[PDB]
Design an enzyme around this catalytic site. Structure first.
Site, mmCIF file in Angstrom:
data_model
loop_
_atom_site.group_PDB
_atom_site.id
_atom_site.type_symbol
_atom_site.label_atom_id
_atom_site.label_comp_id
_atom_site.label_asym_id
_atom_site.label_seq_id
_atom_site.Cartn_x
_atom_site.Cartn_y
_atom_site.Cartn_z
ATOM 1 N N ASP A 71 0.845 -1.187 0.000
ATOM 2 C CA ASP A 71 0.000 0.000 0.000
ATOM 3 C C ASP A 71 0.881 1.238 0.000
ATOM 4 O O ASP A 71 1.836 1.323 0.778
ATOM 5 C CB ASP A 71 -0.936 0.012 1.213
ATOM 6 C CG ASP A 71 -2.241 -0.713 0.950
ATOM 7 O OD1 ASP A 71 -2.655 -1.524 1.804
ATOM 8 O OD2 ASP A 71 -2.852 -0.473 -0.112
ATOM 9 N N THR A 74 -1.117 6.140 -5.457
ATOM 10 C CA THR A 74 -0.243 7.007 -4.681
ATOM 11 C C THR A 74 1.221 6.589 -4.755
ATOM 12 O O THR A 74 2.032 7.072 -3.959
ATOM 13 C CB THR A 74 -0.695 7.043 -3.219
ATOM 14 O OG1 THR A 74 -0.424 5.779 -2.601
ATOM 15 C CG2 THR A 74 -2.186 7.334 -3.130
ATOM 16 N N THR A 75 1.575 5.706 -5.688
ATOM 17 C CA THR A 75 2.946 5.237 -5.837
ATOM 18 C C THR A 75 3.644 5.772 -7.077
ATOM 19 O O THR A 75 4.853 6.013 -7.031
ATOM 20 C CB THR A 75 2.985 3.703 -5.877
ATOM 21 O OG1 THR A 75 2.134 3.229 -6.928
ATOM 22 C CG2 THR A 75 2.516 3.124 -4.551
ATOM 23 N N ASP A 127 -11.729 0.453 -2.844
ATOM 24 C CA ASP A 127 -11.307 0.843 -4.186
ATOM 25 C C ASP A 127 -12.474 0.801 -5.165
ATOM 26 O O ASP A 127 -12.612 1.685 -6.019
ATOM 27 C CB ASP A 127 -10.171 -0.061 -4.663
ATOM 28 C CG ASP A 127 -8.871 0.199 -3.928
ATOM 29 O OD1 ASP A 127 -8.084 -0.756 -3.755
ATOM 30 O OD2 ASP A 127 -8.636 1.357 -3.525
#
Ligand SMILES: Nc1ncnc2c1ncn2[C@@H]1O[C@H](COP(=O)(O)OP(=O)(O)O)[C@@H](O)[C@H]1O
Lengths: 513, 514, 499
Positions: free
Chosen positions: A49, A82-83, A380
């Site tokens: 995550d 968010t990566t 999600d």
């Protein structure tokens, strides 16, 4: 303590940013390995995550703190993704430090990145699709659910939970003027059965947490009732104990409690009340004494939960105990007990409500990681369906969008006066890092595949060619039913541009040297 | 891997060899003395191996295992608690050179077990059996095995006690003996040691009282175990004491309080009370003793736990406790009591105990100056120990080094006859049996190698010839010297040594800790 | 680079490597603190339980081994050795510049091929009683041949077989229960038709009790029930203690009168009884049982359909049982309460003697394995050969399957097949024979076309496993392989820094 004067501070900041982004660059895509975490004790967990790992990360730099704060503050509008923003920011900072070595002011590239992102957004807004009706969002529902979830917690597919989560949003979207609220949907998790036992609570479900399952408990009710008067000896938010300096007051209090039980049951029998829930309670001894004889009723209802009990019925309350009648209460439909285990406690599910303001989902599990992955997939799916109902515009994924944006930026910025090419080309060529990393995470060569897909996209039309991480047949995108929201991509690009500008702006000197 | 277990085994073998070599010059009657120094500076001269083994302290698994083996050997048999250490040391020295070549420990353990079984069968087939159903042959065996433990005058002094203790014919020649189950030899100071006789029932040494006549027959024992101490106060003085008031209260608490308990207890028949040791009582109220002087007074103090256990086993009763007891299970046997002194000092009472299910009889010995009492006690202890050891079996053999050489030659011929790679390991046992005769010849003052070779030649020529003498200082036949030993003291020792060697060889790998 | 966790997980598997096979090595576990203890063990479970590590992968492996040991029988050392070998192979495979995805795919393919070969090679010739009897006997003999203690094995094996065969295909685990009792000789076995207790109040109470009738009365004297006859204490003087004592005495005497008028002769319970009520019950003429175990009353009420009184709630609703003959026979070195005169022969407890310890654990493990293999093969017998026969066949099948798949995952299957052919090597090395020649001969015999070929432990030769008579379980090996594959896939997927 010396002061960092010159260009060493910017170099150290870019090096720290690159070292931070190198951790997120490794884990990219669904084929990424599991990252482990451990605290001071012996609790070792594994997950993947972009937010949970960045939350429990220890750094010794203000720039890294600002970066993780900006990454955590923006996560409610994009859901999953968010990566790649960290890798994009790192690549942009590397290009900036490479172009700045020749003697270029950072203001020029910082201003050029603005129009670069602007023209990229303008090009991405024209390369999409807007032919979605009431069928294009209902028939490929299984395909969208399979592309969102995948094959991480369960190898087989799941159609019940997906349809349940879709209906839970469809019953609130068109009902409140194509709008949805985050406080209306709740996520509940409890171990018990299997993952396929997904339930959609139309009303409100409340647990009680019993103490002894062997105690006789027979269900026999058909009308709920809400009251505010002290039905039993209440607890005024104070831990009561043996604060009586007597020896005969205990039996007197027990007899008074028995007389109060008798009076209360006689009133609810002569007036027609049944399961009356108030806002007070007592110890377990009073509950056991009340459940020993006849008429089953359990107290312990303190806290804000009474609020929902004031909304799952339909009416008002009474200010005085001496103001009760057969019309001041509220009628019910089907209020009974539910316990699928038949060995634990009971649950109450309200099946009578004039509105939908507490619809929730119930998913059973068998461990701690599977239920967490299931709730993450459900969140999600909720985020992606909210983004879908907020705007009927999507785009293809894989790695073609970045290449197309870079090609359009080059074709529209080949002309430059003195600074409209350097920063724009440094922003364009640094966009091919995501597909390269995605191809390198598997077992194929990223450079050759990227060059081949670029040649295929520049030779013919139809910009829908990318890479495949599941090792299938062709490298098409419209055949695998893979889709991605465009609002999320816009928000990610805007956040990356803002972070790059904030990093390139704050770079003078530092006080604690 | 392999280096760490090898180093662990080498360190264990070195530690065991050091433990075995720390004491070795003490086997035989001509052993050397050792002065052990205490931690405070005191020195003590001793020569026994068990005392040195139980006095020293060292932290090591092999040392603790050897100490436990020596303790088990001393508890089981009771004699020869120093040769097992030398046997284990020789076996470990042989296993060292056996493992240095490259042999698995399983084959070595199997060869050791086979050699032990062969030696045990040879010792059982070589020894000659005797008889003991009558009293003449038993007395002959006793007087033949008793004249070789100490010096001549001590033997002549302990012979009366020996023939008095051997007369206890209770078991009709059973498999095992119960000499350690119902024996309580007491000690009394004052008088002549010649006034000794077997006594049944119970023997005490505490004065009952000092009043008129105390010659009754009321069970002769007070089966009571409740608390008799006075109720202690919460502090020194609860209030201010000066004139009366407080004096009358404490006077009534000291006179009219425990007296009610004495009256309510004495309402039951057989007014016989007693108490244990006065290790927790500060002072007993003499007013209760003065009030108890009437209607017969009987009290006996200074009683230990072993005395209670002996009384509850000889008579055949069970003690009771608690105050709320309205039963009648505390009586005993009434026969005769009230005994006087035997022309001398020291009070001692005896009860013959007539008509009792327990026929336990003890020996009341005496002495003077605390010099001949402990010696006689140790003498009769060794006497009954060797009597039990002889009555446990029937086989016997003589010592000196001849059985060791015979077993070594037999093991050599067996390893030469038996085929297989394990035979070499058996040969190691053939090199771990000629240590006792060599040590005896070295301690005597002669050539050990020449004496060992002569003994081996005599054993190969005329089978059973002679051994090693200590008094004369030569090689004479053992049939003239009155000295023998049971076969168990060797068989059990060899089996224990083999078991300890197998246990110390099977343990290896790494030694993890916390 | 990644090497710390790999070394930490490999070193934890080599500590119990010498504890495999019937001829295993022994070691001591020295304790620290105040008193240094010394004990001799011969099992990896006790060593893994009485140890403390700090590595994440090591802790995960220890937890997985403990879970597997709690699930099936003695599956802790083999899975650990297999996981250590798999990790040692994966380290060298990664060091050769190989992506972990291909290794995972090859390991999955090898596991699937091994499972298919194990499912396709299963015997099923058990249509008689003597066949099942000899199969159970061989299974018990193979299970009891792990410590090499030839002293009292045949009698204990026959007793365990007779105890596990009385169930007659009944699926239950709360009927047969064993106890712990030492004293006597190893050659002493007592047979009965019931169970015993574990504590006796004494002999002062009357033992003559007729008309056996079990009555579970959950009457608490210090749990504050309804209508308290007594009261608390005030702050005024020190004379209320006598009143409280008198109230408690009259309350307990009223409870005794009630339990006497209700009709009872042998009172049994599990609560804490004081000295005064016990003495009152003994003087009245009713034997009271106190200080009961946590599983005696439960197993007594489960086999008779009874239950507890729910702390005095419905005394006319809970069904109670009754017996016929109840006495106290002095057997062994302790007096226990007998439970005879019943028609239910499902719950039995065989008392054991001797002067040794660490036997109840292996006895319970053997009984668990026996009842598991009995409930699994109720009508479909599935047994395989032992002595290193299934592993060689699985390795041969993996090697044969790793030849028609062009690509890059063949090296993973080759490494898996190489790691799978190491248990017989360690087994032969732990005894003291030439393991290389025996392994080569076994491989040649398996490749020539002989599915029934194993090694002998008595002489060190190569013979047939179907002629001597040795078998094992079927699901145990499958569960071991699945757990090893899962642990390998979990550990190999981690390579990042420990944060
Ligand atoms: N009278 C004797 N003649 C020859 N040897 C003797 C005689 N008495 C004892 N020995 C030898 O002394 C050895 C035992 O000596 P020691 O260790 O002092 O006694 P213990 O073994 O009882 O402790 C025996 O092996 C025995 O051979």
């Amino acid at each position: 303590k010396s002061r960092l004067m010159g260009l060493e501070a910017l170099k150290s900041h870019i090096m720290a940013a690159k070292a931070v982004a190198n951790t997120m660059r490794t884990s990219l895509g669904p084929n990424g390995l599991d990252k482990m975490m451990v605290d001071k004790d012996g609790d070792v967990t594994v997950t993947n995550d972009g937010a949970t790992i960045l939350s429990m990360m220890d750094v010794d730099h203000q720039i890294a703190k600002l970066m993780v704060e900006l990454s955590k503050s923006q996560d409610d509008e994009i859901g999953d993704g968010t990566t790649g923003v960290v890798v994009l920011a790192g690549a942009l900072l590397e290009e900036a430090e490479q172009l700045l070595d020749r003697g270029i002011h950072p203001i020029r590239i910082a201003d050029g990145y603005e129009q670069a992102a602007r023209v990229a957004i303008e090009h991405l807004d024209k390369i999409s699709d807007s032919v979605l009706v009431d069928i294009k969002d209902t028939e490929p529902l299984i395909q969208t659910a399979k592309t969102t979830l995948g094959s991480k917690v369960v190898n087989s597919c799941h159609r019940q939970m997906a349809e349940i989560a879709v209906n839970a949003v469809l019953t609130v979207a068109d009902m409140e003027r194509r709008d949805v609220d985050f406080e209306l949907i709740k996520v509940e998790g409890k171990v018990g059965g299997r993952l396929e036992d997904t339930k959609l609570i139309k009303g409100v479900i409340v647990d009680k947490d019993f103490s002894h399952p062997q105690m006789p408990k027979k269900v026999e009710d058909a009308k709920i009732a809400i009251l505010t008067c002290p039905f039993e000896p209440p607890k005024p938010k104070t831990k009561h104990k043996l604060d009586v300096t007597s020896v005969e007051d205990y039996k007197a209090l027990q007899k008074y409690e028995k007389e109060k039980f008798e009076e209360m049951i006689q009133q609810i029998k002569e007036t027609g009340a049944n399961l009356a829930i108030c806002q007070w309670g007592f110890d377990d001894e009073a509950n056991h004494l009340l459940l020993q004889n006849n008429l089953p009723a359990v107290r312990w209802v303190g806290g804000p939960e009474i609020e929902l009990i004031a909304i799952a019925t339909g009416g008002r309350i009474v200010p005085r105990f001496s103001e009760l009648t057969a019309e001041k209460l509220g009628f019910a439909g089907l209020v009974q007990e539910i316990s699928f285990g038949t060995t634990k406690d009971k649950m109450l599910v309200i099946e009578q409500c004039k509105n939908s303001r507490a619809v929730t989902i119930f998913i059973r599990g068998g461990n701690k990681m599977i239920i967490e992955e299931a709730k993450r997939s459900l969140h999600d799916a909720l985020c992606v369906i909210r983004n879908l109902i907020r705007d009927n515009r999507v785009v293809y994924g894989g790695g073609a969008a970045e290449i197309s944006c870079a090609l359009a930026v080059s074709q529209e910025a080949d002309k430059c006066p003195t600074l409209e090419q350097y920063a724009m080309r440094a922003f364009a060529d640094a966009l091919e890092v995501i597909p390269m990393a995605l191809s390198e995470n598997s077992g194929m060569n990223p450079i050759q595949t990227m060059t081949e897909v670029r040649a295929r996209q520049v030779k013919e039309m139809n910009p829908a060619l990318g890479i495949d991480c599941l090792h299938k047949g062709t490298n098409d995108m419209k055949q695998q039913h893979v889709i991605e929201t465009l609002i999320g991509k816009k928000q990610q690009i805007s956040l990356a541009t803002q972070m790059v500008r904030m990093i390139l702006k704050i770079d003078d000197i530092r006080k604690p040297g | 891997d392999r280096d760490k277990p090898a180093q662990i085994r080498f360190s264990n073998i070195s530690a065991a060899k050091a433990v075995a070599d720390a004491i070795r010059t003490s086997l035989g009657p001509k052993g050397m003395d050792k002065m052990i120094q205490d931690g405070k500076g005191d020195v003590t001269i001793t020569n026994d191996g068990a005392t040195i083994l139980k006095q020293m302290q060292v932290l090591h698994p092999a040392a603790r295992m050897l100490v436990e083996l020596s303790k088990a050997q001393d508890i089981e048999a009771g004699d020869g608690t120093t040769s097992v250490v030398i046997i284990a040391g020789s076996l470990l020295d042989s296993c060292t050179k056996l493992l240095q070549k490259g042999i698995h420990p399983t084959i070595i353990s199997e060869s050791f077990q086979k050699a032990l079984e062969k030696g045990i069968e040879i010792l059982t087939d070589m020894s000659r059996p005797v008889e003991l159903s009558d009293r003449e042959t038993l007395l002959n065996s006793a007087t033949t095995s008793l004249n070789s433990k100490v010096v001549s005058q001590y033997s002549s002094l302990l012979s009366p006690m020996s023939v008095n203790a051997v007369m206890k014919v209770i078991d009709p020649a059973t498999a095992t003996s119960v000499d350690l189950r119902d024996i309580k030899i007491v000690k009394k100071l004052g008088g002549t040691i010649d006034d000794c006789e077997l006594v049944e029932g119970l023997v005490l040494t505490q004065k009952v009282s000092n009043s008129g006549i105390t010659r009754v027959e009321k069970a002769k024992i007070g089966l009571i175990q409740f608390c008799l101490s006075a109720p202690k106060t919460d502090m020194d003085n609860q209030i201010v004491v000066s004139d009366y008031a407080q004096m009358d209260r404490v006077l009534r608490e000291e006179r009219a309080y425990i007296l009610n308990l004495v009256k309510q207890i004495k309402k039951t028949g057989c007014n016989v009370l007693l108490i244990q040791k006065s290790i927790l009582r500060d002072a007993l109220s003499d007013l209760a003793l003065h009030f108890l002087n009437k209607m017969k007074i009987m009290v006996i103090k200074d009683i230990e736990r072993e005395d209670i256990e002996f009384i509850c086993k000889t008579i055949g009763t069970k003690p009771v406790a608690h105050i709320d007891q309205f039963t009648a299970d505390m009586l005993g046997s009434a026969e005769l009591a009230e005994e006087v002194n035997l022309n001398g000092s020291g009070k001692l009472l005896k009860i013959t105990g007539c008509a009792s299910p327990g026929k336990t009889v003890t020996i009341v010995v005496r002495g003077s100056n605390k010099l001949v009492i402990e010696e006689a006690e140790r003498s009769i202890h060794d006497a009954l120990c060797v009597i039990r050891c002889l009555v446990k079996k029937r086989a016997l053999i003589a010592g000196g080094g001849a059985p060791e050489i015979e077993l070594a030659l037999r093991l050599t011929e067996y390893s030469r006859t038996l085929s297989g790679m394990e035979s070499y390991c058996v040969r190691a046992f053939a090199d771990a049996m000629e240590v006792i005769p060599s040590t005896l010849a070295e301690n005597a003052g002669l050539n050990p190698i020449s004496t060992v070779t002569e003994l081996r030649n005599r054993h190969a020529q005329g089978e059973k010839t002679a051994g090693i003498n200590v008094r004369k200082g030569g090689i004479s036949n053992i049939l003239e010297e009155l000295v023998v030993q049971p076969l168990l003291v060797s068989v059990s020792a060899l089996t224990l040594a083999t078991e300890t060697v197998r246990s110390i060889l099977k343990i290896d790998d790494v030694v993890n800790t916390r | 680079a990644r090497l710390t966790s790999f070394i930490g997980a490999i070193a934890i598997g080599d500590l119990v490597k010498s504890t495999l096979g019937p001829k295993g090595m022994d070691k001591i576990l020295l304790s620290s603190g105040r008193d240094a203890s010394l004990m001799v063990t011969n099992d990896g479970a006790t060593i893994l339980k009485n140890i403390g590590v700090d590595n994440p992968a090591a802790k995960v492996l220890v937890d997985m081994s403990r879970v597997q040991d709690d699930e099936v029988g003695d599956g802790t050392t083999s899975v650990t050795v297999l996981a250590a070998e798999l990790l040692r192979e994966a380290e060298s495979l990664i060091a050769k510049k190989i992506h972990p995805q291909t290794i995972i795919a090859g390991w999955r393919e090898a596991t699937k091929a091994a499972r298919e070969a194990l499912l396709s090679s299963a015997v099923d010739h058990g249509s008689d009683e003597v066949k099942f009897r000899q199969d159970l006997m061989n299974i018990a003999g193979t299970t009891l041949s792990s410590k090499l203690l030839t002293h009292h094995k045949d009698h204990f094996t026959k007793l365990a077989v007779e105890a596990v065969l009385r169930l007659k295909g009944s699926g239950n685990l709360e009927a047969i229960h064993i106890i712990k009792k030492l004293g006597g000789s190893l050659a002493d076995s007592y047979l009965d038709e019931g169970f015993l207790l574990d504590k006796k109040i004494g002999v002062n109470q009357p033992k003559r009790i007729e008309n056996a009738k079990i009555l579970i009365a959950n009457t608490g004297m210090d749990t504050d029930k309804i209508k308290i006859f007594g009261s608390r204490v005030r702050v005024d003087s020190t004379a209320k203690v006598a009143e409280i004592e008198h109230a408690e005495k009259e309350k307990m005497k009223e409870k005794v009168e009630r339990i006497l008028k209700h009709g009872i002769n042998c009172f049994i319970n599990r609560q804490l009884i004081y000295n005064y009520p016990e003495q009152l019950f003994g003087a009245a003429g009713v034997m009271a049982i106190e200080h009961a175990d946590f599983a005696g009353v439960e197993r007594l009420a489960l086999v008779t359909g009874g239950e507890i009184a729910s702390t005095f709630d419905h005394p006319e609703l809970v069904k109670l049982g009754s017996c016929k003959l109840i006495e106290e026979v002095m057997i062994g070195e302790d007096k226990l309460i007998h439970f005879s005169g019943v028609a239910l022969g499902e719950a039995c407890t065989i008392v054991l003697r001797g002067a040794t310890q660490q036997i109840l654990d292996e006895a319970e493990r053997s009984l668990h394995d026996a009842l598991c293999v009995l409930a699994q093969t109720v009508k479909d017998s599935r047994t395989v050969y032992g002595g290193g026969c299934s592993e060689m066949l699985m390795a041969h099948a993996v090697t044969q399957l790793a030849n028609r798949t062009p690509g890059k995952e063949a090296v993973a299957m080759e490494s898996y097949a190489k790691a799978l052919r190491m248990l017989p090597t360690i087994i032969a090395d732990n005894a003291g024979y030439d393991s290389a020649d025996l392994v080569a001969q076994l491989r040649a015999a398996h490749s020539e076309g002989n599915t029934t070929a194993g090694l002998d432990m008595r002489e060190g030769t190569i013979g047939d496993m179907a002629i001597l008579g040795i078998t094992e379980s079927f699901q145990v090996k499958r569960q071991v392989l699945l757990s090893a594959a899962e642990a390998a896939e979990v550990i190999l997927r981690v390579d990042n820094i420990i944060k």
